[PDB]
Amino acid sequence: LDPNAIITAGALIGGGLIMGGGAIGAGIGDGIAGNALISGIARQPEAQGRLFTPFFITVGLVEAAYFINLAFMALFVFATPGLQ
Amino acid sequence: MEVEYVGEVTLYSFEPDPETLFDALLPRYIATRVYAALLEAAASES
């Protein structure tokens, strides 16, 4: 049994957890923010830009967490800490 | 009050519910019409 094999299996499962959590969070948060935007636009025809601004803030906030998780997955599964 | 319909003319945001406001306002409209009738009757009497 190569120790690197156990390390890499653990790292792959960890990266899978990272991406699963990131995708769940991103999808749900983006859906909720988009629901807010859609309801606001439906109520007001001309609220487009003034709702796009806070909607962009929210989307950026959520995608920041998503992409931080993605980067740490890349770290996990391409330069595995503790490997030897 | 028979309903008078026309084709067409930001939608209004009613609270708590449009039906509740309608039910609470229809008697108010009836009272307003009665008051207008009374005022017109007073003017005609004078």
A45 neighbors B10 (Cβ within 8 angstroms): yes
Give the residue from chain A lying closest to B10, CA to CA. Answer: A44
b/e code A56-66 from CB counts within 10 Å (16+ = b): eebbeebbeeb
Given resolution (angstroms): 2.5
Residues of B in contact with A45 (CB under 8 A): 10
Q: Report yes or no on A16 lying in a domain.
A: yes
Rounded Cα gap, residues B22 and B29, in angstroms: 10
- Pseudo-torsion of CA A16, A19, A22, A25, nearest 10°? -70
Contacts 24+ apart (CB under 8 A), A4-9: A4/A83, A4/A84, A7/A80, A7/A82, A7/A83, A7/A84, A8/A80, A8/A83
A49 found inside a domain = yes
Q: Does A2 touch chain B (CB under 8 A)?
A: no
Please state, in angstroms and rounded to a whole number, the distance separating the CA atoms of residues B46 and B31.
23
CATH of the domain at A41: 1.20.20.10
Tell me if A35 is assigned to some domain. yes
Contacts of A46 in chain B (CB under 8 A): 10
Any domain includes A84 = no
Number of domains comprising chain A: 1
The coordinates were experimentally obtained by cryo-EM
Q: Which residues of A touch B11 (CB under 8 A)?
A: 43
In-domain check, residue A30? yes
By the CB < 8 Å criterion, does B12 face chain A? no
* A83 belongs to a structural domain: no
Q: Is position A32 within any domain? A: yes
Domain that holds residue A24: 3-78
End-to-end CA distance of chain B: 30
